[PDB]
Amino acid sequence: MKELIYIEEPKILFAHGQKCTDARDGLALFGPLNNLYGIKSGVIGTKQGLKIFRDYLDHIQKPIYNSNSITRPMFPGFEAVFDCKWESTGITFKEVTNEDIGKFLYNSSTHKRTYDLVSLFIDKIISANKNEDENVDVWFVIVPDEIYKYCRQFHDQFKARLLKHTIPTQIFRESTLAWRDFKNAFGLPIRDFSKIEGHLAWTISTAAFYKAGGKPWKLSDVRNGVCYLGLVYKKVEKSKNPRNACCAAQMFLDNGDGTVFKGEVGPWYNPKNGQYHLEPKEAKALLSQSLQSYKEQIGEYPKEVFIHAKTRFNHQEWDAFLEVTPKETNLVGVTISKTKPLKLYKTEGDYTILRGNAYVVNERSAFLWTVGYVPKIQTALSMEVPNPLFIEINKGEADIKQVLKDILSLTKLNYNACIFADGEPVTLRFADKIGEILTASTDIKTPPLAFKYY
Amino acid sequence: KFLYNSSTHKRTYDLVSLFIDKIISANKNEDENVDVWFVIVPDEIYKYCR
Amino acid sequence: DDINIDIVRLNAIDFKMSWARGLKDILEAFEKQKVPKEVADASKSNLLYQQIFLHDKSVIEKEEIYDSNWLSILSFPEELRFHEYNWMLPKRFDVRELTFPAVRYKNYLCTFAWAYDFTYHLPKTETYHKSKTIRIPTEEILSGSYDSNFIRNAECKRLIVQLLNKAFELRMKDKEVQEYEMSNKTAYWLEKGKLEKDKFEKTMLVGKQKDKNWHFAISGASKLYPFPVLMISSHIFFTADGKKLIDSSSVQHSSRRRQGKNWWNNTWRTKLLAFIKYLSDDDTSFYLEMGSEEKVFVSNEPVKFKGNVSYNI
RNA sequence: UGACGGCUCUAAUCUAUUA
DNA sequence: TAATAGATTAGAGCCGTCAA
């Protein structure tokens, strides 16, 4: 007989001061926070890729309906939602011949063909950005179903090699936008989106609007003076050793006005294999970088810093953290895990445990159900029984209830997708994506450090 | 802090450094999409920067 | 006191806190006053009506207790013994083959059993002394009151975990269960036969889909955090005939994914409860072996969880 | 690179002990 | 410099997302 506490669902702030809980409903009811005028689409690829992009873009002008609009809200249309003109008349097309892909695909090696394909694509994009007068806001790279299949590394290297030019790029697969046509040898769509077409339109439109300089939404309930972080460790494989720990971080204050969320980036390296920990000098450098980023933007150092991680800290890096941390700044190192196999079953039958139930084990440890039944959409976010996140304050002092509330608040800022909520604080997810991109090509000085470029 | 030095190359270099560093930081790590940048220089910079 | 006097006595609709809530209020008033409205399109303008209700919340506030996969540990044997087999224990001798679980240490043997409980395996230990073996109580080491330089309390807890896991592995050998070796754990599942070809208190434990048979499997692991418990994980395995498994990871993964496509919370909970009730030695628990006279009894009911906020259909 | 969830499998590291 | 176990990690691959 144990007890479960409950924490209220956070609200995200939309246009003209309107809050809500679902991103899709809030967008369809009030629209994005900011106002763009239009999106100038640059397209790079084959002629049939241009045709697919054009017909999909003209497809998402008109409203799209789901099989059950309660679980998946309908998409009213791009100009209806985002009040921006993302129309087929703004396309600037660069032609990549199928024969070039023929030479660069049918070789024997895998690294060399990936490098050749990336060289071709980024070279066309770089030339079009450098020595042309047409302006492109987002470059869409429509690849056939022979690159993402036979060369999957291509995406990571492609995004890593464009970082020196700050080109917002959106990769697409021909089957993604031509799922109706892209049937199998049996004549059946392997990617049947008939009942969830509006969901795909929501995701694509929100990603494109975000990469084009727009801010669709932001969380409304987060206190000032607290800066959140997320550190993730990746293995680099192209080096001499099998793996060397590479730490990359994402960063999030609140703002002067609203939702500063950039990512304290610039990878740090520990050569010892398996030691997912920071040496004192690297921890000092990272903490100083984040603190200076806060200081230059607001003018005073934050009073609370909530460092997240998927690993446990050791004492050396923690004391280094305190060494560089000022005396007036609180430091709370939290750890978030998933491998603990706890499961709560509903005794009443079909539907699963409601999302938001917290099993506060003690002052410094609790379980949180960030994924589960949501009463508003009337559906569980998983298929099997969801597994909670084991959130335990590893170092420092802070309320466990407040920590759980902040973790449930930071699971809504997934601009890469249009869903109700994520199953992990988005800071860690975006730090993971940044590290994955950065550890693909080992030549980037002062990485761009903005999420639209990743 | 830069305009009141002695050498003309040094003050020009520091001023251009300030401006272009702010512009490049804004370009690299801000989520906006600025189409054209507009540099409003007071009538005390270009007057003595040539 | 600033609203004009010509509208104060009129009822007002609140819009300050939200516009969707105010819109819902407007719609309620309009429907209750029967205001004309038409042009119901084939594109279902009722969906927009559904969405502009803002939406509901968890105001129902039921209790709706929940169960788990956690078995509470109760009635722990009072102490564990270290047997100083200084030269009595032969070297290059593993400890797994012992019918009675133990862990090798520096020179001793760590177990809940008494000294002469391994007479068959090591008959030379007949003349073993009692003053050699040192006894550590269990009820106080769990609370963290123990501290020594001979052994660390955390290492003792890890040793207890090892003993419990060894006992759990041993107890399924004679329980007529079939074991499967996964990536890092062993899963124990019942076979065809013993039931009415499928049942346990009315729960289909082994079934058959389109072509082959699917079996429900349980994996277990002992822990002491937050408190001494036994954790259970569920699995679905596939056999072509029922007596022979498929030695392919990809086929098994595909079949497991397809079978779990239709299962829901009630199915998982009932199957877990039936499987765990099967292993019962008595009416309300089941015991694991650590001593000739000392047993570790485990509750056969999962640790229930209680909430105060819930939902409905 | 449309996006999430869930499993499976493969590896390494740190604690202790013994060869 | 190989053996156990526990505990902690990351990475790669694959299927479901509907109404039946």
JSON list of C-alpha atoms in Angstrom, two decimals, chain A residues 162-279:
[
{"chain": "A", "resi": 162, "resn": "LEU", "atom": "CA", "xyz": [26.84, 22.49, -43.38]},
{"chain": "A", "resi": 163, "resn": "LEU", "atom": "CA", "xyz": [27.56, 23.98, -39.95]},
{"chain": "A", "resi": 164, "resn": "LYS", "atom": "CA", "xyz": [30.26, 26.32, -41.26]},
{"chain": "A", "resi": 165, "resn": "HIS", "atom": "CA", "xyz": [27.65, 28.09, -43.42]},
{"chain": "A", "resi": 166, "resn": "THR", "atom": "CA", "xyz": [24.58, 28.23, -41.08]},
{"chain": "A", "resi": 167, "resn": "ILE", "atom": "CA", "xyz": [22.11, 26.73, -43.55]},
{"chain": "A", "resi": 168, "resn": "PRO", "atom": "CA", "xyz": [18.77, 25.58, -42.03]},
{"chain": "A", "resi": 169, "resn": "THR", "atom": "CA", "xyz": [18.12, 22.29, -43.82]},
{"chain": "A", "resi": 170, "resn": "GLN", "atom": "CA", "xyz": [15.21, 19.84, -43.78]},
{"chain": "A", "resi": 171, "resn": "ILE", "atom": "CA", "xyz": [15.87, 16.36, -45.13]},
{"chain": "A", "resi": 172, "resn": "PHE", "atom": "CA", "xyz": [12.93, 14.47, -46.61]},
{"chain": "A", "resi": 173, "resn": "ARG", "atom": "CA", "xyz": [12.43, 11.01, -48.06]},
{"chain": "A", "resi": 174, "resn": "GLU", "atom": "CA", "xyz": [10.47, 10.55, -51.27]},
{"chain": "A", "resi": 175, "resn": "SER", "atom": "CA", "xyz": [8.26, 7.99, -49.53]},
{"chain": "A", "resi": 176, "resn": "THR", "atom": "CA", "xyz": [7.49, 10.47, -46.73]},
{"chain": "A", "resi": 177, "resn": "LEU", "atom": "CA", "xyz": [5.59, 12.85, -49.03]},
{"chain": "A", "resi": 178, "resn": "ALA", "atom": "CA", "xyz": [4.57, 10.27, -51.66]},
{"chain": "A", "resi": 179, "resn": "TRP", "atom": "CA", "xyz": [3.36, 7.52, -49.33]},
{"chain": "A", "resi": 180, "resn": "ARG", "atom": "CA", "xyz": [0.28, 6.99, -51.51]},
{"chain": "A", "resi": 181, "resn": "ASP", "atom": "CA", "xyz": [2.42, 6.26, -54.57]},
{"chain": "A", "resi": 182, "resn": "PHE", "atom": "CA", "xyz": [5.30, 4.52, -52.75]},
{"chain": "A", "resi": 183, "resn": "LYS", "atom": "CA", "xyz": [3.73, 1.08, -52.53]},
{"chain": "A", "resi": 184, "resn": "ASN", "atom": "CA", "xyz": [5.68, -2.16, -52.27]},
{"chain": "A", "resi": 185, "resn": "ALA", "atom": "CA", "xyz": [6.05, -4.94, -54.84]},
{"chain": "A", "resi": 186, "resn": "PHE", "atom": "CA", "xyz": [2.74, -6.24, -53.46]},
{"chain": "A", "resi": 187, "resn": "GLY", "atom": "CA", "xyz": [0.99, -2.98, -54.33]},
{"chain": "A", "resi": 188, "resn": "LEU", "atom": "CA", "xyz": [0.46, -1.99, -50.67]},
{"chain": "A", "resi": 189, "resn": "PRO", "atom": "CA", "xyz": [1.63, 1.24, -48.97]},
{"chain": "A", "resi": 190, "resn": "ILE", "atom": "CA", "xyz": [4.42, 0.35, -46.55]},
{"chain": "A", "resi": 191, "resn": "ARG", "atom": "CA", "xyz": [3.88, 3.81, -45.01]},
{"chain": "A", "resi": 192, "resn": "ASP", "atom": "CA", "xyz": [0.09, 3.99, -44.79]},
{"chain": "A", "resi": 193, "resn": "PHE", "atom": "CA", "xyz": [-0.70, 7.49, -43.47]},
{"chain": "A", "resi": 194, "resn": "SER", "atom": "CA", "xyz": [-4.37, 7.54, -44.51]},
{"chain": "A", "resi": 195, "resn": "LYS", "atom": "CA", "xyz": [-5.75, 7.86, -40.97]},
{"chain": "A", "resi": 196, "resn": "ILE", "atom": "CA", "xyz": [-2.88, 10.04, -39.68]},
{"chain": "A", "resi": 197, "resn": "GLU", "atom": "CA", "xyz": [-2.30, 12.38, -42.63]},
{"chain": "A", "resi": 198, "resn": "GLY", "atom": "CA", "xyz": [-3.15, 15.40, -40.49]},
{"chain": "A", "resi": 199, "resn": "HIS", "atom": "CA", "xyz": [-0.55, 14.30, -37.94]},
{"chain": "A", "resi": 200, "resn": "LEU", "atom": "CA", "xyz": [2.15, 14.20, -40.62]},
{"chain": "A", "resi": 201, "resn": "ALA", "atom": "CA", "xyz": [1.05, 17.60, -41.92]},
{"chain": "A", "resi": 202, "resn": "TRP", "atom": "CA", "xyz": [1.19, 19.03, -38.38]},
{"chain": "A", "resi": 203, "resn": "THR", "atom": "CA", "xyz": [4.69, 17.66, -37.81]},
{"chain": "A", "resi": 204, "resn": "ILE", "atom": "CA", "xyz": [6.10, 18.82, -41.15]},
{"chain": "A", "resi": 205, "resn": "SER", "atom": "CA", "xyz": [4.49, 22.27, -41.00]},
{"chain": "A", "resi": 206, "resn": "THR", "atom": "CA", "xyz": [5.66, 22.90, -37.44]},
{"chain": "A", "resi": 207, "resn": "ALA", "atom": "CA", "xyz": [9.22, 21.79, -38.21]},
{"chain": "A", "resi": 208, "resn": "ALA", "atom": "CA", "xyz": [9.37, 23.95, -41.35]},
{"chain": "A", "resi": 209, "resn": "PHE", "atom": "CA", "xyz": [7.90, 26.96, -39.53]},
{"chain": "A", "resi": 210, "resn": "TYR", "atom": "CA", "xyz": [10.42, 26.56, -36.70]},
{"chain": "A", "resi": 211, "resn": "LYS", "atom": "CA", "xyz": [13.41, 26.25, -39.03]},
{"chain": "A", "resi": 212, "resn": "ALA", "atom": "CA", "xyz": [12.25, 29.34, -40.95]},
{"chain": "A", "resi": 213, "resn": "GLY", "atom": "CA", "xyz": [12.75, 31.59, -37.92]},
{"chain": "A", "resi": 214, "resn": "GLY", "atom": "CA", "xyz": [9.37, 31.24, -36.22]},
{"chain": "A", "resi": 215, "resn": "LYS", "atom": "CA", "xyz": [8.57, 30.44, -32.60]},
{"chain": "A", "resi": 216, "resn": "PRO", "atom": "CA", "xyz": [5.35, 28.38, -32.51]},
{"chain": "A", "resi": 217, "resn": "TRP", "atom": "CA", "xyz": [4.76, 28.20, -28.74]},
{"chain": "A", "resi": 218, "resn": "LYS", "atom": "CA", "xyz": [6.45, 28.40, -25.36]},
{"chain": "A", "resi": 219, "resn": "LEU", "atom": "CA", "xyz": [5.87, 27.26, -21.80]},
{"chain": "A", "resi": 220, "resn": "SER", "atom": "CA", "xyz": [4.13, 29.76, -19.53]},
{"chain": "A", "resi": 221, "resn": "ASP", "atom": "CA", "xyz": [4.79, 28.48, -15.99]},
{"chain": "A", "resi": 222, "resn": "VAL", "atom": "CA", "xyz": [8.52, 28.59, -15.19]},
{"chain": "A", "resi": 223, "resn": "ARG", "atom": "CA", "xyz": [10.09, 30.83, -12.56]},
{"chain": "A", "resi": 224, "resn": "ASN", "atom": "CA", "xyz": [12.81, 33.34, -13.34]},
{"chain": "A", "resi": 225, "resn": "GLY", "atom": "CA", "xyz": [16.41, 33.17, -12.18]},
{"chain": "A", "resi": 226, "resn": "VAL", "atom": "CA", "xyz": [16.76, 29.41, -12.80]},
{"chain": "A", "resi": 227, "resn": "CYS", "atom": "CA", "xyz": [18.80, 27.99, -15.69]},
{"chain": "A", "resi": 228, "resn": "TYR", "atom": "CA", "xyz": [18.38, 24.36, -16.77]},
{"chain": "A", "resi": 229, "resn": "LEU", "atom": "CA", "xyz": [21.02, 22.21, -18.44]},
{"chain": "A", "resi": 230, "resn": "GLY", "atom": "CA", "xyz": [21.32, 18.78, -19.97]},
{"chain": "A", "resi": 231, "resn": "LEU", "atom": "CA", "xyz": [24.57, 16.88, -20.52]},
{"chain": "A", "resi": 232, "resn": "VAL", "atom": "CA", "xyz": [24.86, 13.80, -22.74]},
{"chain": "A", "resi": 233, "resn": "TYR", "atom": "CA", "xyz": [27.88, 11.60, -23.46]},
{"chain": "A", "resi": 234, "resn": "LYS", "atom": "CA", "xyz": [28.48, 10.14, -26.92]},
{"chain": "A", "resi": 235, "resn": "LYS", "atom": "CA", "xyz": [31.08, 7.77, -28.34]},
{"chain": "A", "resi": 236, "resn": "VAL", "atom": "CA", "xyz": [33.28, 8.91, -31.22]},
{"chain": "A", "resi": 237, "resn": "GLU", "atom": "CA", "xyz": [34.14, 6.00, -33.50]},
{"chain": "A", "resi": 238, "resn": "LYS", "atom": "CA", "xyz": [36.30, 7.57, -36.24]},
{"chain": "A", "resi": 239, "resn": "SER", "atom": "CA", "xyz": [39.14, 8.09, -33.74]},
{"chain": "A", "resi": 240, "resn": "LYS", "atom": "CA", "xyz": [41.98, 5.64, -33.13]},
{"chain": "A", "resi": 241, "resn": "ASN", "atom": "CA", "xyz": [40.36, 4.15, -30.02]},
{"chain": "A", "resi": 242, "resn": "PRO", "atom": "CA", "xyz": [37.00, 2.35, -30.15]},
{"chain": "A", "resi": 243, "resn": "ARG", "atom": "CA", "xyz": [35.37, 5.15, -28.13]},
{"chain": "A", "resi": 244, "resn": "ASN", "atom": "CA", "xyz": [36.31, 8.37, -26.35]},
{"chain": "A", "resi": 245, "resn": "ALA", "atom": "CA", "xyz": [33.68, 10.09, -24.22]},
{"chain": "A", "resi": 246, "resn": "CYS", "atom": "CA", "xyz": [32.32, 13.27, -25.80]},
{"chain": "A", "resi": 247, "resn": "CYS", "atom": "CA", "xyz": [30.02, 15.45, -23.69]},
{"chain": "A", "resi": 248, "resn": "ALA", "atom": "CA", "xyz": [27.59, 17.84, -25.37]},
{"chain": "A", "resi": 249, "resn": "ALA", "atom": "CA", "xyz": [25.02, 19.97, -23.58]},
{"chain": "A", "resi": 250, "resn": "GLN", "atom": "CA", "xyz": [21.77, 21.83, -24.10]},
{"chain": "A", "resi": 251, "resn": "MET", "atom": "CA", "xyz": [20.87, 24.92, -22.10]},
{"chain": "A", "resi": 252, "resn": "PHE", "atom": "CA", "xyz": [17.64, 26.75, -21.24]},
{"chain": "A", "resi": 253, "resn": "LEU", "atom": "CA", "xyz": [17.06, 29.81, -19.10]},
{"chain": "A", "resi": 254, "resn": "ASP", "atom": "CA", "xyz": [13.60, 31.32, -18.99]},
{"chain": "A", "resi": 255, "resn": "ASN", "atom": "CA", "xyz": [14.34, 34.67, -20.70]},
{"chain": "A", "resi": 256, "resn": "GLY", "atom": "CA", "xyz": [14.29, 38.37, -20.32]},
{"chain": "A", "resi": 257, "resn": "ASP", "atom": "CA", "xyz": [10.90, 38.00, -22.06]},
{"chain": "A", "resi": 258, "resn": "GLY", "atom": "CA", "xyz": [10.29, 34.43, -23.27]},
{"chain": "A", "resi": 259, "resn": "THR", "atom": "CA", "xyz": [11.84, 30.97, -23.85]},
{"chain": "A", "resi": 260, "resn": "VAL", "atom": "CA", "xyz": [15.55, 31.31, -24.48]},
{"chain": "A", "resi": 261, "resn": "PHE", "atom": "CA", "xyz": [16.49, 27.76, -25.50]},
{"chain": "A", "resi": 262, "resn": "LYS", "atom": "CA", "xyz": [19.79, 27.50, -27.39]},
{"chain": "A", "resi": 263, "resn": "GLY", "atom": "CA", "xyz": [22.15, 24.84, -26.07]},
{"chain": "A", "resi": 264, "resn": "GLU", "atom": "CA", "xyz": [25.54, 25.39, -24.44]},
{"chain": "A", "resi": 265, "resn": "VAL", "atom": "CA", "xyz": [27.50, 23.48, -27.06]},
{"chain": "A", "resi": 266, "resn": "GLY", "atom": "CA", "xyz": [31.13, 22.84, -27.97]},
{"chain": "A", "resi": 267, "resn": "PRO", "atom": "CA", "xyz": [32.02, 19.27, -27.18]},
{"chain": "A", "resi": 268, "resn": "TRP", "atom": "CA", "xyz": [34.26, 18.25, -24.30]},
{"chain": "A", "resi": 269, "resn": "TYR", "atom": "CA", "xyz": [36.40, 15.13, -24.43]},
{"chain": "A", "resi": 270, "resn": "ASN", "atom": "CA", "xyz": [37.42, 12.47, -21.91]},
{"chain": "A", "resi": 271, "resn": "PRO", "atom": "CA", "xyz": [39.85, 9.96, -23.47]},
{"chain": "A", "resi": 272, "resn": "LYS", "atom": "CA", "xyz": [39.32, 7.20, -20.91]},
{"chain": "A", "resi": 273, "resn": "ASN", "atom": "CA", "xyz": [37.01, 4.54, -22.33]},
{"chain": "A", "resi": 274, "resn": "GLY", "atom": "CA", "xyz": [33.69, 4.16, -20.52]},
{"chain": "A", "resi": 275, "resn": "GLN", "atom": "CA", "xyz": [34.33, 7.06, -18.11]},
{"chain": "A", "resi": 276, "resn": "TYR", "atom": "CA", "xyz": [31.20, 9.12, -18.78]},
{"chain": "A", "resi": 277, "resn": "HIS", "atom": "CA", "xyz": [32.50, 11.82, -16.45]},
{"chain": "A", "resi": 278, "resn": "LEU", "atom": "CA", "xyz": [34.08, 15.25, -16.86]},
{"chain": "A", "resi": 279, "resn": "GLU", "atom": "CA", "xyz": [37.63, 16.07, -15.85]}
]
